[PDB]
Amino acid sequence: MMNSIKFIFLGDVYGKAGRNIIKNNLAQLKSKYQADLVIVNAENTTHGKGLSLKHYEFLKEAGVNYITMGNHTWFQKLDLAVVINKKDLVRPLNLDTSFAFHNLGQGSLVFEFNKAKIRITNLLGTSVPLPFKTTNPFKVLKELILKRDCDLHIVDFHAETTSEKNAFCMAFDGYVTTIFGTHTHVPSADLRITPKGSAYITDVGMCGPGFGSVIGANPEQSIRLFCAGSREHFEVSKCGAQLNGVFFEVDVNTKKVIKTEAIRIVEDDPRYLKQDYFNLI
Ligand SMILES: [Fe+3]
Ligand SMILES: [Fe+3]
């Protein structure tokens, strides 16, 4: 018989484009994989940064069960007290006490699902430039692990560097169920069940604007930044869309990952064809 739990983890939700492609495909995907639970990083949901209450309910009504965040966790000030306090939402645990919000919400949570105590933890890589101070991710997660209270442990490591990501993978490989990297907005072809029985991927990717955008932003301001050096406001792209995620199923008994598959959907937009960014635009 052997009962397992089938999950679906989606990368950084970015703007209206990300919101829409998830609403239009989650049911189908949930059905295709017979998924039991859906987890998503929603750090870029509202206007490319943070999550409004309105958008939190949207994701919730779209089928999302749990949410992890990142460096833009606290941008939507108006509803943060209410949003990040949501019981099924986890923010970076890795926060230094000098930072306001160091105690606003959960950095890790536990719930049980069919004879299984499941833990979801979110952390910030030391390689990510932040306006505030953070504690060491490696040390923090190690201490949490030594607390030994969970059969499954899902980790969303929001980091910038491939070296920090893989060093993290090497450090906690068998001590956790999954180590999924996020933050670069580009999926890696890294996905696999590790030699120790965990699931790993350098970066899940993003759920937001598609080809014709720069990591979710309008190309114009981006090209200018890298050319002239102008600091002109970033703008959310409305060009097409992409959905990136990971499907994985554990085994409640051995609590080892038994299967993994990368999930990807790309929608091109004809409006990109009319663009001529070459005129360093
Ligand atoms: Fe992001
Ligand atoms: Fe980020």
From Swiss-Prot:
Q: Name one Pfam family in it.
A: YmdB
- GO MF term set: 2',3'-cyclic-nucleotide 3'-phosphodiesterase activity; metal ion binding
Classification from the root reads: Bacteria, Bacillati, Mycoplasmatota, Mycoplasmoidales, Mycoplasmoidaceae
- EC annotation from Swiss-Prot or TrEMBL: 3.1.-.-
What does the record give as cofactor? Fe(3+)
What family does the entry list?
Belongs to the YmdB-like family.
UniProtKB keywords: Hydrolase, Iron, Metal-binding
Give the binding site residues for Fe cation 1.
D12, E43, N44, H185
Show the active-site residues.
H72 (proton donor)
Q: Where, in this chain's numbering, is Fe cation 2 bound?
A: E43, N71, H158, H183
- Protein name, per record: Putative phosphatase/phosphodiesterase MPN_349
The membrane-spanning stretches of this chain are none
